[PDB]
Every structure is written in structure tokens, then in C-alpha cells.
Amino acid sequence: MTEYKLVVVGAGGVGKSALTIQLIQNHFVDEYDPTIEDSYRKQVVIDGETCLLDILDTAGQEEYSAMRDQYMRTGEGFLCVFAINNTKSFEDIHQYREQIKRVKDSDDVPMVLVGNKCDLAARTVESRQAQDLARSYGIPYIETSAKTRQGVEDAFYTLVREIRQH
Ligand SMILES: Nc1nc2c(ncn2[C@@H]2O[C@H](COP(=O)(O)OP(=O)(O)NP(=O)(O)O)[C@@H](O)[C@H]2O)c(=O)[nH]1
Ligand SMILES: [Ca+2]
Ligand SMILES: [Mg+2]
Ligand SMILES: [Mg+2]
Ligand code: NA
Structure with a gap:
């Protein structure tokens, strides 16, 4: 069966572990x-295919930014998470994407951008900006x-569908 190596990345406290x-x-x-x-x-069935999701839940605290190079090498697809009530976490996304691009030496790495905590009303990142x-x-x-x-399965399954287009 097909194995998909997914990596969840983003700033501290945005909900990476809660999503996973x-x-x-x-x-x-x-x-x-x-x-x-x-x-x-x-193990899950996605569009008629039985497959194994291997998910790495990473640190958002910058004290562990050293470990990023390693998991960025081995990941096949990346869920880049920010929180819709944390403007700085949205501004931080670009850092993560640039580092993934460098390590993979590719402009076309499977990724999905995820705006989490959408149950909260204190929104400072508007959907259109993301x-x-x-x-x-x-x-x-x-x-x-x-x-x-809301959206949890869709986010992870969409990332699997992105890995399949590559
Ligand atoms: N209201 C709400 N709270 C959330 C949501 N996702 C996470 N949280 C809350 O936000 C806090 C941090 O969540 P957590 O998943 O631990 O964040 P993280 O991105 O894994 N943090 P780290 O990078 O330090 O491991 C927790 O108190 C959790 O309950 C959400 O969608 N809505
Ligand atoms: Ca609980
Ligand atoms: Mg966590
Ligand atoms: Mg604004
Ligand atoms: Na980075």
C-alpha cells in the first residue's frame, strides 16, 4: 500500500498538534x-486507495529550528499552518516555505496552506489575504x-491529493 509522509509545520501555538x-x-x-x-x-482509504499516512508533528518554538532541515528532507508533503487570530503566525509562513524550497531544491513541493482556529471570532487574517x-x-x-x-480531514486529504499530482 502507498505510504504518504506528511509534515505539519508552523509557528508555536497555531494548533498543529490539535489538528493532527x-x-x-x-x-x-x-x-x-x-x-x-x-x-x-x-491507515485510511482515500478515493478508493488504501494508504498509510505517516505524519510528523513538529515544533513551532524557534528553539528547535535546528531540526527543520532534517524533516524537510524526508517529508513528501507539508501542511503549513497559521492561526486566523495571530497575524504574526501568518507572516511567519513565508519563512517555512522558503526553507522547504531550499532544502528540496524545488519550486513545486506539495503543500497546503491551513488557516486554523476558525471557530474563534478574533480574526486578524482575512480569508482573502491567505x-x-x-x-x-x-x-x-x-x-x-x-x-x-471543521476542515480537518479535508486539509490532510487535500494534501494527499496534491502529492498525487506530483
Ligand atoms: N479554539 C481553538 N483552539 C485551538 C485550535 N487548535 C488548537 N487550539 C488550542 O491552541 C493551543 C495550542 O494548540 P497546539 O495544537 O498545542 O499548538 P501547536 O501548534 O502544536 N504548538 P507547538 O508548536 O508549541 O507544538 C491549545 O490550547 C489548543 O487547545 C482551534 O482550532 N480552535
Ligand atoms: Ca479534550
Ligand atoms: Mg504541538
Ligand atoms: Mg488587516
Ligand atoms: Na524555516
Whole structure:
């Protein structure tokens, strides 16, 4: 069966772990325990294909930015997450995409841009601003809430569908 190596990246506190745990374990993590580097694996059927998702949940705290080069080499597709109530986390996305491009030596790496925490009303990043950024990269933009599970499966499955176009 096909294995897909997915990597979840983004600034501290944007909901990377909450998104991944919703997908894999179907509950919402309310507390904030910062991640170093955790792996998850789930067998799923996507568009009639049985496949294994191997998901790497990475650190957003900049103290671990050294580990980025390694997981960027081995990842096949990247979920670039920001939070829609954290302007700085959106501004930080470009850093992540430039580093992925350099390490992969490619302008066409499978990626999806994810605006998380869309259940919150304190929005400072408007959907149109994120759509424009994703359009410049040539990738989809999807909004999610790990709390309500809105968009969670869609974000990860869309990334699988992007890896298949490459
Ligand atoms: N309301 C709401 N809260 C969320 C959502 N996603 C995450 N959170 C909350 O935000 C906090 C941080 O979430 P977490 O997944 O740990 O963030 P992270 O990106 O993995 N942090 P790190 O990079 O340090 O590992 C938690 O308190 C969590 O419950 C969401 O979609 N909505
Ligand atoms: Ca909980
Ligand atoms: Mg985390
Ligand atoms: Mg504004
Ligand atoms: Na980076």
C-alpha cells in the first residue's frame, strides 16, 4: 500500500498538534503542551486507495529550528499552518516555505496552506489575504478548526491529493 509522509509545520501555538490528534485520535486537545517532534501513523482509504499516512508533528518554538532541515528532507508533503487570530503566525509562513524550497531544491513541493482556529471570532487574517498568498505559491488554502473538526480531514486529504499530482 502507498505510504504518504506528511509534515505539519508552523509557528508555536497555531494548533498543529490539535489538528493532527483530531485526525488520528478523534478528540480535541484543550491544553497546550509544546511539541518537540512526534510521529503518528494511520491507515485510511482515500478515493478508493488504501494508504498509510505517516505524519510528523513538529515544533513551532524557534528553539528547535535546528531540526527543520532534517524533516524537510524526508517529508513528501507539508501542511503549513497559521492561526486566523495571530497575524504574526501568518507572516511567519513565508519563512517555512522558503526553507522547504531550499532544502528540496524545488519550486513545486506539495503543500497546503491551513488557516486554523476558525471557530474563534478574533480574526486578524482575512480569508482573502491567505487565498492571495496560497495563489502565489500555487497551492490550496483551507480553513480549519481542530476544536469543531471543521476542515480537518479535508486539509490532510487535500494534501494527499496534491502529492498525487506530483
Ligand atoms: N479554539 C481553538 N483552539 C485551538 C485550535 N487548535 C488548537 N487550539 C488550542 O491552541 C493551543 C495550542 O494548540 P497546539 O495544537 O498545542 O499548538 P501547536 O501548534 O502544536 N504548538 P507547538 O508548536 O508549541 O507544538 C491549545 O490550547 C489548543 O487547545 C482551534 O482550532 N480552535
Ligand atoms: Ca479534550
Ligand atoms: Mg504541538
Ligand atoms: Mg488587516
Ligand atoms: Na524555516
